[PDB]
Amino acid sequence: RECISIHVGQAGVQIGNACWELYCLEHGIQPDGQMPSDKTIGGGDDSFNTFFSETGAGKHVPRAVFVDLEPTVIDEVRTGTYRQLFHPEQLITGKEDAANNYARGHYTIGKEIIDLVLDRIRKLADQCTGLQGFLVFHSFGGGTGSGFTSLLMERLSVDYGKKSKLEFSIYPAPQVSTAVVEPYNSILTTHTTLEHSDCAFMVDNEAIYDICRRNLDIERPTYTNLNRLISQIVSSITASLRFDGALNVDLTEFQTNLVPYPRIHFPLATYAPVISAEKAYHEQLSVAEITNACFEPANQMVKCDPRHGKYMACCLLYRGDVVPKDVNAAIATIKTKRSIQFVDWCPTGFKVGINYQPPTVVPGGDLAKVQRAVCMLSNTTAIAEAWARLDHKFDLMYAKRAFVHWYVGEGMEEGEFSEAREDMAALEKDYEEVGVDS
Amino acid sequence: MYTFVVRDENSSVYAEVSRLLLATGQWKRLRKDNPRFNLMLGERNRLPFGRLGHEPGLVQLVNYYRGADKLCRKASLVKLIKTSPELSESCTWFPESYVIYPDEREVFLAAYNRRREGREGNVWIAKSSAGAKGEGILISSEASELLDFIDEQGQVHVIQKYLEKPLLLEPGHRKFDIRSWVLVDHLYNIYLYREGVLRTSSEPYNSANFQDKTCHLTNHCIQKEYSKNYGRYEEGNEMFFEEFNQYLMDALNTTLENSILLQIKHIIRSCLMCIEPAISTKHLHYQSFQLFGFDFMVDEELKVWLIEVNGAPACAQKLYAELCQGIVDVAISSVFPLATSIFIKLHH
Amino acid sequence: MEVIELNKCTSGQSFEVILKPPDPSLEEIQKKLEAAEERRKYQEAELLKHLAE
Amino acid sequence: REIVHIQAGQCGNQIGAKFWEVISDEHGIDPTGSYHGDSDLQLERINVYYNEATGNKYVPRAILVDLEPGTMDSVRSGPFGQIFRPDNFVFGQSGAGNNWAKGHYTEGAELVDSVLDVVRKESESCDCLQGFQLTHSLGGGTGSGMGTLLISKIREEYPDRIMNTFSVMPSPKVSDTVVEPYNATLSVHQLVENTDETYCIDNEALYDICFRTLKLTTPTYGDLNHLVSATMSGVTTCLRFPGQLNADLRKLAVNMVPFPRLHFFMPGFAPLTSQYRALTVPELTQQMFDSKNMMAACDPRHGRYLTVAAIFRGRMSMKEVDEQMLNVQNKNSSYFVEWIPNNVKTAVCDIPPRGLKMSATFIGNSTAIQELFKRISEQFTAMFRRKAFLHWYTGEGMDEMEFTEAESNMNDLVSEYQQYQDATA
Ligand SMILES: Nc1nc2c(ncn2[C@@H]2O[C@H](COP(=O)(O)OP(=O)(O)OP(=O)(O)O)[C@@H](O)[C@H]2O)c(=O)[nH]1
Ligand SMILES: Nc1ncnc2c1ncn2[C@@H]1O[C@H](COP(=O)(O)OP(=O)(O)CP(=O)(O)O)[C@@H](O)[C@H]1O
Ligand SMILES: Nc1nc2c(ncn2[C@@H]2O[C@H](COP(=O)(O)OP(=O)(O)O)[C@@H](O)[C@H]2O)c(=O)[nH]1
Ligand SMILES: COc1ccc(/C=C(\C)C(=O)c2cc(OC)c3c(c2)OCO3)cc1O
Ligand SMILES: [Ca+2]
Ligand SMILES: [Ca+2]
Ligand SMILES: [Ca+2]
Ligand SMILES: [Mg+2]
Ligand SMILES: [Mg+2]
Ligand SMILES: [Mg+2]
């Protein structure tokens, strides 16, 4: 049951790079594609084969497509450490980018490159015997990441109607953002993509930035830092697809376990522990401590306050030295001290998965090796706070029609702005209906 | 130069706070919608907590605790006291109360009948979190009239036992209530303003007539409006702690601290410590402080009863200057330092 | 506090702990993109007319 | 991401020449076009402004235009004169007599096609043309009249490419002829319609900086142009060197211009120089936002910032830069429009300009720029109400109506700036 990864725009590509580097480290795959521990040469249907195909010469090749409308970012993949991992058809670049303009990525340029992308994706699909769907990595804020991604999602729904689609989306933050129009792009892409995505993991760059500042003691985090952290979270989420396990073994299960209502499909991710490599000796956090840390806003991928929302589903994904008894003990403890309210029509429970292999880190990196870690995926109404933030920024510019002429000049209509914003307003109201009392 | 914004033009307390901040010369007020602020003096309703703490390079403070409404709405206060392990359902300082929707109707009726058969006093009061300024309150010893009154309204009500044996000030044989101001800062320290106020009735207490709600309702507005003896005994029907302590000494051979304030400090502590895990901002991306107004009754046994908690209290005029200065000292400058405490810190 | 559906294997295990019971077609996409392209073409045509003047 | 550079008229070619000297120096290109630098950062985006010729030579993608040959003879005689492509000198013999009509309609019209042939030749060899940048003055005839005509023709041939200008505004304080307000107003009229981004380089501000700050009693065009070189280097840094932003002219336009007409930028620079003590980042930031460092004679405290782009150059704490910039906005939050969140963007480049350990360059889209157009407008009106000096223009075939139209458009522009200066919530 294969899984295809699609990385769109700079954020999607660089995070993709980080993730596949990490995947290779975790499965014992070298930069040249060889995998010594793999005794079946030229094929097999092991778990890691969900993400890697095999050549007759024993090369293990990522089931991935990289797409960017300019070439500078993907060129670094082409000439980088893991260049031998990929075939050139997997790496697609145009000559000029979307200029931070959703409409330019979706309409003007998207129309010219979408079929090429679909063809390359189809080539990967043909290899698959039982494809389950796609993992799509992109920023909210970029012209390509927003516009082209939304176009691509529409077309993927058309060409693979059965398949599941999962999103990993970088929500825009003023600290590391690029464009002043990123709220616009975010609302436009969320509106166009909402029907076509089964489960979306938002990562607020603000949260990652502060985690890097606070716990890694990095004064001014770079994209490399952010991406190594993010890749740790992504690996936690996809480990169940790549390894033997019983929890979340196919893309459909993410939808089944985390999303009771289709529009409300943005689970909050929380990760612990994030410990600095520079710290020579560490106090190893116990199951109780990392599980408790999962309910601290300072460890969330999106800053918000789950105490003032309601849960619809909670998932705990441990890696390393963890046994069920310890988890149940810790959960017992945490219930009595924490504000954890579920909606009345959902069971108050946790789905737990434990992978015995402790997390892997990039050598000479900023993250320390720890003996146990946990990523919590919880669908809480609290994440609507992020939408409220974004929509407000949108409302501020749109009231004056600031920058709108750049979008209209690309063939988009002004009406799409208000259509998208109305959809977001509906989304917020949905969150409030599910989560708020009188 | 710190910056702040004002989003509640109706708050007397924070009008004064704002004035003081400006007068320090180190605070600048911005237009209410400018996001680049250090301090938000927020609006009473739908305060956008979700937008706080996302401004790079700005430590941000707001004058409200998200979640504190649980204490400051009557229905939700009843529910909180009845369902919180830390506050016994049998907790002794809160008057037997029931939440009724225009629901604990049958429960209330059951207790009521139990009281009727046992010859006991059965005078209850109906009040709406909805109702305001003494409007929508009914005191009756018949359940039927209360429920009829509630059903004619549109929002949730509470039926709570009337305290038929209140402590009466002499002369005048008159009722009163106690207002305490409590400031909770960003570290969740609990500061009780040393100065409380007694809001008194200027009419003789009459248990044979609960329809005349003048000597039954302490409310300053109600006394100022309907009482023709308003201000006869004390100015603005407000007695302060120096005089009240002296009265307790002369009349009952006891002090305000021993007979009453121990109980009050206990109740304040219990309530705030109860919800601390739910509303604390110690690890949040923004920080909260808030001024509360606790309102108490004292019965003839010198027992203290919590009546209600107010999330946006006004102050007694003569006290505005001091308290407000205190707010700037411990709640604001503590976070944003400028270039003999009036508060009792309630430890925990 | 009930543990259910415990599954084990050499690489790990999983279980559930309960604490309390309780699309547009291709043609339409093509039309959207072509409508946008057309609006771009109209705007450019207006510009080239203006420049010709 | 190639840029085609065009310089027209006397002013345009003099500041254009200094620009090429300065950035050639920064990229380690000697006057013969040979590379002799020490850092690969110098070459990574060298293509944005330079073509490669045989023998690993680098030749500016620059077109030199004039209606008389004097200044271009001066360029060819100059220090880096040998570096320019000989075929890319396009000049007439007649001149334009400081007359917009001659540049735009009569003298210039004859020479325009030759320029376009050279433009076409340069564009067609571009991997992916980013757009065009034009240097010129607005107060003369060639740079103003022919320059605007060139921009109009280029838009026609390349409607989908960005047009960027460095436009030098006239000032009575540094004046060649009385008709400069006519030429500038006519010019501004064209620029509002046909450019995406215009840097307003005000000769009044240059003179004032030279006189008051640099303590030069009698400023020459050499001195003013030293300021202009520094400013042009700064505002093209992000285009010329590897960075986090992936900077180009289209992203600049998209992010700086909230409304199509309001694309006239106020440049600024720090430190102002003609000491061996490098500035501290707080000093850089303070001076950078100071009215006395603005290259347009406008007081930013008399308006509000729509958007801002900042470039810090040199080895400095990026943390400290962030702190200082955030500090400026928070302290002065009043002067930044609240209906554009996060309207200030900062970039950093490790390579400092020559002779400085560190510098800061400022690009503001501020409503205060209206003061410049107002100033021109007043000077225009004073003459036009009596039709003074008009025969120079009507003798070239123009009608008064064209003047009236241009005056109206500029006044509207001023009204639009005021309109957004007053917008709230
Ligand atoms: N976490 C993280 N965020 C990134 C990264 N690269 C870009 N971003 C964020 O993405 C947003 C900008 O979108 P980009 O991905 O750079 O733009 P794009 O998708 O290539 O689209 P274009 O406009 O054509 O360049 C900003 O919010 C950046 O902070 C990255 O490598 N890691
Ligand atoms: N259970 C009770 N027993 C006796 N008296 C009571 C009572 N409940 C309320 N009262 C009287 O009614 C007065 C006002 O009641 P309550 O405080 O609930 O109304 P309110 O909230 O509109 C005024 P505030 O907001 O100032 O407290 C009290 O000051 C007290 O005199
Ligand atoms: N800053 C600056 N301004 C100049 C320079 N040369 C001319 N000017 C100004 O440009 C205007 C005259 O235009 P000019 O370029 O000489 O005429 P043109 O050749 O027909 O374009 C006047 O406002 C002069 O002050 C220069 O080298 N630097
Ligand atoms: C106010 O918000 C912004 C304002 C400007 C920009 C600029 C971008 C993305 C550039 O590409 C850019 C930046 C620049 O300097 C910061 C440039 C430039 C282009 O041309 C030369 O100087 C990005 C923004 O988010
Ligand atoms: Ca195999
Ligand atoms: Ca679908
Ligand atoms: Ca020809
Ligand atoms: Mg990009
Ligand atoms: Mg009240
Ligand atoms: Mg001249």
DSSP D359-395: EEEEEEEEGGGHHHHHHHHHHHHHHHTTTTTTHHHHT
Q: Which of D245, D254, D416 should one mutate to test binding to chain A, selecting the residue with the greatest count of A CBs within 10 A?
A: D254
The three-state (H, E, C) secondary structure of C32-46, written as one string: HHHHHHHHHHHHHHH
Do D120 and D174 belong together in one domain?
yes
Rounded to the nearest angstrom, the minimum Cα separation between A291 and chain B is 16
Q: In what order do the strands lie in the sheet with D2-8?
A: D89-91, D62-66, D2-8, D129-137, D162-169, D197-202, D264-270, D358-366, D305-314, D344-349
The closest-lying atom of ligand 2 relative to the alpha carbon of residue B199 is 29
Would you say A397 and D341 are in contact if contact means Cβ atoms under 8 Å apart? yes
Distance CA B13, CA B22 (A): 14
Would you say D367 and D414 are in contact if contact means Cβ atoms under 8 Å apart? no
**Which of D326, D338, D424 is facing B57, going by the closest CB pair?**
D326
Q: How many domains does chain D have?
A: 3
Q: What residues contact residue B186 under an 8 Å CB cut-off, 6+ apart?
A: B61, B281, B282, B287, B288, B289, B331, B334, B335
| Enclosing domain of residue D271 | 259-368
**Which of A97, A178, A402 is facing D339, going by the closest CB pair?**
A402
| Nearest alpha carbon to residue C2 among C15, C13, C18 | C18
State whether the Cα torsion B327-B333-B334-B339 is positive or negative: negative
Distance CA D226, CA D233 (A): 11
Distance CA A55, CA A325 (A): 43
DSSP D82-131: GGS-GGGEEE-SS--TT-HHHHHTSHHHHHHHHHHHHHHHHHHT-SSEEE
CB contact under 8 A, A307 and B67: yes
Residues in chain C after which the chain is broken, C→N over 2.5 Å: 22
Distance CA D182, CA D175 (A): 13
CB contact under 8 A, C26 and A111: no
CATH tag, A268-382: 3.30.1330.20
**Which pair of structure tokens corresponds to residue A10?**
């700079």
**Which of A245, A324, A410 is facing C11, going by the closest CB pair?**
A245
Which CATH number does the domain housing residue D14 bear?
A: 3.40.50.1440
**CA-derived radius of gyration, chain C:** 30
CB contact under 8 A, D156 and C51: yes
Residues in chain B after which the chain is broken, C→N over 2.5 Å: 102, 339
- What residue spans of B118-176 are helical by DSSP H? 143-151
Would you please indicate which residues of A are annotated as catalytic (active-site) residues?
A: 253
Q: What DSSP character marks residue D153?
A: H
Report the nearest-CA residue for atom 4 of ligand 1. A11
State whether the Cα torsion D407-D413-D418-D422 is positive or negative: positive
Give B200's strand partners: B176
Distances (CA, A) of D160 to A22, C14, D131: 42, 57, 9
| Nearest alpha carbon to residue A16 among A47, A62, A70, A60 | A62
Which CATH number does the domain housing residue D344 bear?
A: 3.30.1330.20
- Ligand 8 center from residue A140 Cα (angstroms): 11
State whether the Cα torsion B197-B203-B207-B209 is positive or negative: negative
**Hey, which bits of chain B come out as E strands?**
2-6, 27-29, 39-41, 61-62, 97-100, 124-128, 138-140, 157-161, 176-184, 190-193, 197-200, 238-240, 287-288, 290-298, 304-310, 343-345
Please name the amino acid found at residue A375. C
| Nearest alpha carbon to residue A140 among A2, A53, A10 | A10
Q: Do domains B1-63 and B64-95+165-348 have the same CATH topology?
A: no
- B142: enclosing H helix or E strand: none
Report the nearest-CA residue for atom 4 of ligand 3. D11
Report the nearest-CA residue for atom 13 of ligand 3. D140
Q: Is A53 exposed, middle or buried (0-12, 13-18, 19+ CB in 10 A)?
A: middle
Of how many residues is chain A composed?
438
Do D212 and D297 belong together in one domain?
no
Burial pattern A372-401, b for ≥16 Cβ within 10 A else e, equals: bbbbbbbbbbbbbbbbbbbbebbebbbebe
Of how many residues is chain C composed?
53
Q: What DSSP character marks residue D209?
A: I
The correct CATH number of B96-164 out of 3.30.1490.20, 3.40.50.1100, 3.40.50.1820, 3.40.30.10 is 3.30.1490.20
- A93: enclosing H helix or E strand: strand A91-93
Q: Which of D258, D280, D312 is the last residue before a domain boundary?
A: D258
Distance CA B129, CA B143 (A): 19
* Other beta carbons within 10 Å of A123: 13
* Other beta carbons within 10 Å of B345: 11
CB contact under 8 A, A95 and D246: no
Q: Which of D188, D223, D258 is the last residue before a domain boundary?
A: D258
Q: Are strands D62-66 and D2-8 parallel, antiparallel or unpaired?
A: parallel
Report the nearest-CA residue for atom 11 of ligand 4. D247
Do D230 and D325 belong together in one domain?
no
Distance CA A288, CA A269 (A): 18
Chains A and B touch (3+ CB pairs under 8 A): yes
The structure's method of determination equals X-ray
The correct CATH number of A1-267 out of 3.40.630.10, 3.40.50.1440, 1.20.1340.10, 3.30.365.10 is 3.40.50.1440
The residues in A 241-270 lying below 8 A from C, measured between CB atoms, are 243-247
Q: What residues contact residue B106 under an 8 Å CB cut-off, 6+ apart?
A: none
Cis? peptide before A363, omega within 30° of 0: no
End-to-end CA distance of chain B: 34
State whether the Cα torsion D208-D209-D210-D214 is positive or negative: positive
Long-range contacts of C22-31 (CB under 8 A, 24+ apart): C22/A342, C22/A344, C22/A345, C22/A346, C22/A347, C23/A154, C23/A157, C23/A158, C23/A161, C23/A195, C23/A196, C24/A154, C24/A158, C25/A158, C26/A155, C26/A158, C29/A151, C29/A154, C29/A155, C29/A158
CATH topology of domain B64-95+165-348: D-amino Acid Aminotransferase; Chain A, domain 1 (3.30.470)
CA D216 to chain centre: 23
Which CATH class for the B1-63 domain? Answer: alpha beta
Q: Are strands B290-298 and B157-161 parallel, antiparallel or unpaired?
A: unpaired
Q: Are strands B287-288 and B238-240 parallel, antiparallel or unpaired?
A: unpaired
CA D400 to chain centre: 29
Distance CA D331, CA B43 (A): 24
| Nearest alpha carbon to residue B343 among B187, B178, B179, B183 | B183
Residue showing tokens 């992010």: D255
Please name the amino acid found at residue D204. E
Q: Which residues of chain D are within 8 Å of residue C47 when distances are taken between CB atoms? A: 155, 159
| Nearest alpha carbon to residue B287 among B14, B30, B48, B59 | B59
**Subunits adjacent to chain B (3 or more Cβ pairs under 8 Å):** A, D
Resolution of the model in angstroms:
2.4
**Hey, which bits of A337-412 come out as E strands?**
348-355, 372-380
User: In chain A, where are the structural domains located?
Assistant: 1-267, 268-382, 383-438
| Nearest alpha carbon to residue D213 among D294, D97, D325, D313 | D294
**Which pair of structure tokens corresponds to residue A292?**
């408790």
Do D202 and D126 belong together in one domain?
yes
Distance CA B78, CA B99 (A): 7
Do D413 and D307 belong together in one domain?
no
Ligand that comes closest to the CA of residue A140: 1
Nearest-by-CA chain A residue for B56: A175
Distances (CA, A) of D402 to A271, A344, D388, D389, D415: 67, 73, 15, 15, 20
| Nearest alpha carbon to residue A160 among A2, A44, A53, A13 | A2
The three-state (H, E, C) secondary structure of D261-309, written as one string: CCCEEEEEEECCCCCCCCCCHHHHHHHHCCHHHECCCCCHHHCCEEEEE
Distances (CA, A) of A417 to A102, A148, B5: 11, 17, 30
Q: CB of A141 closer than 6 A to ligand 1? A: yes
Please name the amino acid found at residue B172. G
Nearest-by-CA chain C residue for D149: C51
Distance CA B6, CA B18 (A): 8
Q: Which residues of chain D are within 8 Å of residue B36 when distances are taken between CB atoms? A: 329-330, 333
Phi/psi for B57 (5° steps) reads 85, 10
Q: Which of D227, D258, D289 is the last residue before a domain boundary?
A: D258
CB contact under 8 A, D156 and C44: no
Which CATH number does the domain housing residue D388 bear?
A: 1.10.287.600
Residues in chain D after which the chain is broken, C→N over 2.5 Å: 274
Phi/psi for B177 (5° steps) reads -135, 160
Q: CB of D221 closer than 6 A to ligand 3? A: yes
Distance CA B287, CA B345 (A): 20
User: In chain B, where are the structural domains located?
Assistant: 1-63, 64-95+165-348, 96-164
* Other beta carbons within 10 Å of A205: 24
Do D355 and D219 belong together in one domain?
no
Q: Which residues of chain A are within 8 Å of residue C25 when distances are taken between CB atoms? A: 158
Q: What DSSP character marks residue B345?
A: E
| Nearest alpha carbon to residue B4 among B40, B34, B57, B35 | B40
* Other beta carbons within 10 Å of B220: 20
Superfamily, domain A383-438: Helix hairpin bin (1.10.287.600)
* Other beta carbons within 10 Å of C41: 11
Residue showing tokens 């976070």: B335
CB contact under 8 A, A349 and C10: no
Do D44 and D71 belong together in one domain?
yes
Do D240 and D266 belong together in one domain?
no
